[PDB]
Amino acid sequence: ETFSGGCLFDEPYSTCGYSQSEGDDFNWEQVNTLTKPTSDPWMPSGSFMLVNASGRPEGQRAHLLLPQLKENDTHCIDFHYFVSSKSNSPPGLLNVYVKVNNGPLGNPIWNISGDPTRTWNRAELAISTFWPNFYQVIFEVITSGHQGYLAIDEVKVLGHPCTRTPHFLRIQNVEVNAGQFATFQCSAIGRTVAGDRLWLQGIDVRDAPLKEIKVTSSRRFIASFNVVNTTKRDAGKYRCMIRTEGGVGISNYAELVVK
Ligand SMILES: *[C@@H]1O[C@H](CO)[C@@H](O[C@@H]2O[C@H](CO)[C@@H](O[C@H]3O[C@H](CO)[C@@H](O)[C@H](O[C@H]4O[C@H](CO)[C@@H](O)[C@H](O)[C@@H]4O)[C@@H]3O)[C@H](O)[C@H]2NC(C)=O)[C@H](O)[C@H]1NC(C)=O
Ligand SMILES: *[C@@H]1O[C@H](CO[C@H]2O[C@@H](C)[C@@H](O)[C@@H](O)[C@@H]2O)[C@@H](O[C@H]2O[C@H](CO)[C@@H](O)[C@H](O)[C@H]2NC(C)=O)[C@H](O)[C@H]1NC(C)=O
Ligand SMILES: *[C@@H]1O[C@H](CO)[C@@H](O)[C@H](O)[C@H]1NC(C)=O
Ligand code: NA
Ligand code: NA
């Protein structure tokens, strides 16, 4: 029993290999408004995972974890999400995390500050981590203190590149000596436009600046990030990150070596 990674929440979520945490503050609820309706104006319809934020203080955390995914083909994760609030004010933050090969949680690769618009919005994830390696998508709500709803009514894992996000190509470790720049060549397939934010995130390390985006064709660009005048207190793991109006794409972790 492997898992596609995805879930309509029509069956119990453990059917999809989704799980929760007992190490945090609560749990997501699983609802179906067709089988038990609700006259709550701020409630969405259908089958979904819900956070009810009523009588929850600020700071409270709750994780819905995807099965570990061990993909061969370049693929796409998209989820569909909903937020509502009685106040014109948000019920919580929603964060998406990726741990790769059982690693540290790291930072949210994608997040909304949860503005309560009671509509559904798509977001797609383009993760470059493949068999024999694996990763785990983790949905984390953190409550604002005000009442309302955050919901996810379906996650889909498709076997093709993401449409609204470029995806990165394997990026190799970088090795240099001392007082001299270290260049990361974040090479992608797809299109990038104005709004798009592009960045190299290093754990425990101040982020290298975007140095340039060099577009080679309608389907290929390289974003390059320069860590200048390098020392030992610079060495660690780096990753390519693109945020577009549609999703987030992330390369594998490249490592930095200093001689
Ligand atoms: C998001 O969180 C909110 C806080 O937990 C929920 O609001 C609560 O919703 C319930 C609705 O069931 C409401 O209280 C009802 O329950 C009482 C306790 O049993 C009861 O006295 C009333 O309901 C009915 O049940 C009794 C027998 O049990 C019968 O005598 C009657 O038939 C009676 O009508 C009562 O209305 C709360 O007022 C409300 N709590 C708060 C603090 O706001 C939301 O439901 C939840 N959203 C969803 C849809 O998940
Ligand atoms: C991702 O790809 C892995 C590649 O291994 C081989 O898979 C078979 C089908 C064949 O196409 C080979 O040429 C290919 O390299 C898959 O690994 C599995 O391969 C077998 C079929 O499941 C299986 O007997 C074997 O035990 C298994 N594991 C290994 C390490 O070889 C893997 O299944 C695949 N995952 C998916 C479904 O994406
Ligand atoms: C979370 O997302 C916002 C955009 O909503 C971004 O600018 C902010 O800095 C992000 N923080 C992270 C990366 O956790
Ligand atoms: Na939980
Ligand atoms: Na659903």
- The CATH number of the domain holding residue 152 is 2.60.120.200
State the Cα–Cα distance between residues 90 and 58, nearest whole angstrom.
11
Joined tokens for residue 39: 């006259």
The verdict on 70 and 193 lying in the same domain is no
Of 119, 146, 162, which residue sits at a domain end? 162
Enclosing domain of residue 139: 1-162
State the Cα–Cα distance between residues 252 and 250, nearest whole angstrom.
7
- Which of 217, 219, 161, 214 is closest to 190 using CA atoms? 219
Q: How many folded domains does the chain comprise? A: 2
The verdict on 29 and 64 lying in the same domain is yes
Cα(228) to centroid(ligand 4), Å:
42
The verdict on 104 and 150 lying in the same domain is yes
* Cα-based distances in Å from 165 to 75, 96, 119, 168: 11, 16, 21, 10
Amino acid, single-letter form, for residue 135:
Y
Instruction: Enter the resolution in angstroms.
Output: 2.7
The verdict on 106 and 169 lying in the same domain is no
CATH of the domain at 245: 2.60.40.10
State the Cα–Cα distance between residues 226 and 224, nearest whole angstrom.
7
Contact 188/229 with Cβ under 8 angstroms? Answer: no
Which residue, by CA, sits nearest to atom 38 of ligand 2? Answer: 71
Joined tokens for residue 251: 């390369």
Q: How many C-beta atoms surround the C-beta of residue 50 within 10 A?
A: 19
State the Cα–Cα distance between residues 168 and 189, nearest whole angstrom.
6
Of 144, 162, 180, which residue sits at a domain end? 162
Task: Give the full edge-to-edge strand order of the sheet including 135-143.
Answer: 19-20, 61-65, 135-143, 92-100, 110-112
Q: How was this structure determined?
A: X-ray
- Mutation probe of ligand 3 site: the residue of 95, 96, 105, 111 with most atoms within 8 A of C-beta: 111
Q: What is the DSSP letter of 109?
A: S
Of 146, 162, 178, which residue sits at a domain end? 162
Query: Which residues, 6 or more positions from 137, have their beta carbon under 8 angstroms from its beta carbon?
Result: 5, 65, 66, 69, 77, 96, 97, 98, 125, 155
